[PDB]
A paper describes a structure:
DbpA is a helical lipoprotein of ~19 kDa that promotes B. burgdorferi attachment to connective tissues and components of the extracellular matrix (ECM), including glycosaminoglycans (GAGs) such as decorin, dermatan sulfate, and heparin. By virtue of its ability to adhere to GAGs, DbpA influences B. burgdorferi tropism for specific tissues and cell types. In fact, the B cell response is so robust in humans that anti-DbpA antibodies are considered diagnostic of Lyme disease. In this study, we report the first in-depth characterization of a human MAb (“F945”) against DbpA, a highly immunoreactive lipoprotein expressed by B. burgdorferi during human infection.
Author numbering:
A (entry chain H): 1 to 135, 142 to 222
B (entry chain A): 26 to 53, 73 to 176
C (entry chain L): 1 to 212
C-alpha cells in the first residue's frame, strides 16, 4: 500500500532556501534508507542525496554537496531535504524514494509523485480556464492559459472520464506564462445528455477551478 | 546506530579489510596474485565476521533493533570491495541471508554472519589450496 | 567519480521486436547496476536489479546481463505499452544514473482527425482570442499545421504542442494554438487550419466563420 507524498514545491527566488518533505505510510519506515532524485524539465534523472536507515550516514552528489542536507525523523515518518543557495539549474521535479532493500543503501525502489521546484524571480500566477466547445465522434476540451509555475492537473468529470483524454504538454508563451490545452473525444450522441466538466488544479497559486463545457 | 566499543571495534575491523584491499590494490583462477589477494582478503574479512559474531553475542540481551541492523549494514558495505576482488555473489550472500533472518535480533545477525563466514572460508580454502 | 554512459540515445522499434540497450561504466562496478523504466508522466520503475535479476511482478519479456563495465538490457518482444525512457543506475560509488534511452514505437501510418475550436466568448471578453486546432491520434509525429485567416498565411503567432506517443495505439496528438487580439479577431471572418501529413492523400483544411 506504500505511498510517498512530496511537498514544498513552487517558486523560490534564486539564492534563497527551500525545504522539501516526504510522507511515508504505509510500511516500516525505520527499516529503510531513502533517496532524493530530481529530473529537470525534459532532462534525465539525477541522483542528488541519500540517507541510511539510521541518520548516521548522509550521501550527496557532487552537484549539490555542501549545499543540500538530507534528514529523517522516524517519529514523524517524514524525510527532509534542505536546499540552500538555489540556482536556476536546480529547477526540477524532486522525487523522494524508498530503498529497494531493507537497511542498506542500494537503489530507489518505491518513488513518490514528485514535487516541482521553480527557481525563478517571476511571480506565481494562477491560470484562466476557457471552454473549447464542440461542433460519429465529437471533440471538446478546456484551455488553461497564463499560469506560472508548472504544473497544472486537468481531470474530466472529477476523474470519471478517462478514455479519449489528451492533456497536452504546457507551452511557454512569450509572456513568460504557461499555456496548456486538454481535450477529450466523446460520441456526439452523449452531448446533450452527459455533462462534461474539466477540473483544473494549480497548487502553487491555490487555483481549484471547474468549468462546464457544452456545445454552442 | 552502533554505540560504544561495539562501534569502535566493528568499524576498525571493517576498515582493516579495506586497508588490506587498498594495500593489495597498490602493493604491486590461475593468476598467483589474484590467488594470494583472495587468501589475504578473506583472512582479514573473517576476523571482521568473528567480531560481528562476538559483539552481537555480547549485545544479545541489551542491544536494540537499530544496533543489530547497523551490523548488517556494515557487513553489506564490506562485501562490496570483497566482491570487486573476484569473490562473486559476496553481496548476494549477506543480502539473501538478511531476507531469511532479518537483523533485528542478535540471533538474526548471527545467522547472517554464519553464512558470510562460511562463504569467506570456502573462498579462503579454495584459493589457498590452489597455491600448491 | 563513476560515469555511466548509456547507448543509444534513442531508438525506434516495431511491436514484437527485440530491443537492446547498453550501459557502460567508466570503472568496474561489479554487478551493482539497476535498470529503470519511466513511462510518460510517471515516476521511474525498477525493472532489473543487480544487472541480471528480474524484479518481482515485472513481465518476463525484460531481462538484463553483464558485469564489470559493460551492461545490457533487453526487451524480448516489445509491446506498445513499453514506450518509455530507460535508465541504468549504478551504486558502486554513491549513486548515479545514465543519460537514458528513449524507446519509440514504429507502427503503420495513421492519418490525424482534424478539429477546429474558435475562441471562447469568455476569453474574448479579456481582449485576446485563441483559436485551437487539434490533430488527434496520428503516426508518425511529423506533421505540418498552417493557419489561414481570410486566406492569408500566418507565421509567428502560433505554438505547437505534441503529446507523448500513446501506450495503447502508439499514436501522437498535436495541438496548434493561434493567438491574436480581440480587435484582430473581429477584423476577419474565415479562420482555416490546413494540415499536411503522410497519412493524408491531400492536405485537409478545417475552417469556421466567426459567429457562424
Amino acid at each position: 500500500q506504500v505511498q510517498l507524498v512530496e511537498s514544498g514545491g513552487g517558486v523560490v527566488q534564486p539564492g534563497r532556501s527551500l525545504r522539501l518533505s516526504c510522507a511515508a505510510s504505509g510500511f516500516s519506515f525505520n527499516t529503510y534508507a531513502f533517496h532524493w532524485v530530481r529530473q529537470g524539465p525534459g532532462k534525465g534523472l539525477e541522483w542528488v542525496a541519500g540517507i541510511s536507515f539510521d541518520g548516521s550516514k548522509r550521501y550527496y552528489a557532487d552537484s549539490v554537496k555542501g549545499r543540500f542536507t538530507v534528514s529523517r525523523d522516524n517519529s514523524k515518518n517524514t524525510l527532509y531535504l534542505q536546499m540552500n543557495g538555489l540556482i536556476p539549474e536546480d529547477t526540477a521535479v524532486y522525487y523522494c524514494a524508498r530503498d529497494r532493500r531493507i537497511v542498506v543503501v542500494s537503489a530507489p525502489g518505491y518513488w513518490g509523485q514528485g514535487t516541482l521546484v521553480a527557481v525563478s524571480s517571476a511571480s506565481t500566477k494562477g491560470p484562466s480556464v476557457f471552454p473549447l466547445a464542440p461542433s460519429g465522434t465529437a471533440a471538446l476540451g478546456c484551455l488553461v492559459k497564463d499560469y506560472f509555475p508548472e504544473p497544472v492537473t486537468v481531470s474530466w468529470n472529477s476523474g470519471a472520464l478517462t478514455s479519449g483524454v489528451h492533456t497536452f504538454p504546457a507551452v511557454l508563451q512569450s509572456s513568460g506564462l504557461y499555456s496548456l490545452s486538454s481535450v477529450v473525444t466523446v460520441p456526439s450522441s452523449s452531448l446533450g445528455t452527459q455533462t462534461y466538466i474539466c477540473n483544473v488544479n494549480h497548487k502553487p497559486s491555490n487555483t481549484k477551478v471547474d468549468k462546464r463545457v457544452e456545445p454552442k | 546506530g552502533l554505540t560504544g566499543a561495539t562501534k569502535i571495534r566493528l568499524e576498525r575491523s571493517a576498515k582493516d579489510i579495506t586497508d588490506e584491499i587498498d594495500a593489495i590494490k597498490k602493493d604491486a583462477s590461475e593468476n598467483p596474485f589474484i590467488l594470494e589477494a583472495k587468501v589475504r582478503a578473506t583472512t582479514v574479512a573473517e576476523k571482521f565476521v568473528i567480531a560481528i559474531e562476538e559483539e552481537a553475542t555480547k549485545l544479545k540481551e541489551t542491544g536494540s533493533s537499530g544496533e543489530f541492523s547497523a551490523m548488517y549494514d556494515l557487513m553489506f558495505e564490506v562485501s562490496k570491495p570483497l566482491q570487486k576482488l573476484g569473490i562473486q555473489e559476496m553481496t548476494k550472500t549477506v543480502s539473501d541471508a538478511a531476507e531469511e533472518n532479518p537483523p533485528t535480533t542478535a540471533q538474526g545477525v548471527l545467522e547472517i554472519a554464519k553464512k558470510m563466514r562460511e562463504k569467506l572460508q570456502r573462498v579462503h580454502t579454495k584459493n589457498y589450496c590452489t597455491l600448491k | 567519480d563513476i560515469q555511466m554512459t548509456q547507448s543509444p540515445s534513442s531508438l525506434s522499434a516495431s511491436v514484437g521486436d527485440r530491443v537492446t540497450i547498453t550501459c557502460q561504466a567508466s570503472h568496474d562496478i561489479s554487478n551493482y547496476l539497476n535498470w529503470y523504466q519511466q513511462k510518460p508522466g510517471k515516476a521511474p520503475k525498477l525493472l532489473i536489479f543487480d544487472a541480471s535479476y528480474l524484479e518481482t511482478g515485472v513481465p518476463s519479456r525484460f531481462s538484463g546481463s553483464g558485469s564489470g563495465t559493460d551492461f545490457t538490457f533487453t526487451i524480448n518482444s516489445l509491446q506498445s505499452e513499453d514506450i518509455a525512457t530507460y535508465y541504468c543506475q549504478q551504486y558502486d560509488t554513491l549513486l548515479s544514473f545514465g543519460g537514458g534511452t528513449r524507446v519509440e514505437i514504429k507502427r503503420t501510418v495513421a492519418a490525424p482527425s482534424v478539429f477546429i475550436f474558435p475562441p471562447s466568448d469568455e476569453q474574448l471578453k479579456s481582449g485576446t482570442a485563441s483559436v485551437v486546432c487539434l490533430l488527434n491520434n496520428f503516426y508518425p509525429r511529423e506533421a505540418k499545421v498552417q493557419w489561414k485567416v481570410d486566406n492569408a498565411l500566418q507565421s509567428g503567432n502560433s505554438q505547437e504542442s505534441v503529446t507523448e506517443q500513446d501506450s495503447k495505439d502508439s499514436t501522437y496528438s498535436l495541438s496548434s494554438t493561434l493567438t491574436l487580439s480581440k480587435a484582430d479577431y473581429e477584423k476577419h471572418k474565415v479562420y482555416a487550419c490546413e494540415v499536411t501529413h503522410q497519412g493524408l492523400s491531400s492536405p485537409v483544411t478545417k475552417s469556421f466563420n466567426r459567429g457562424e
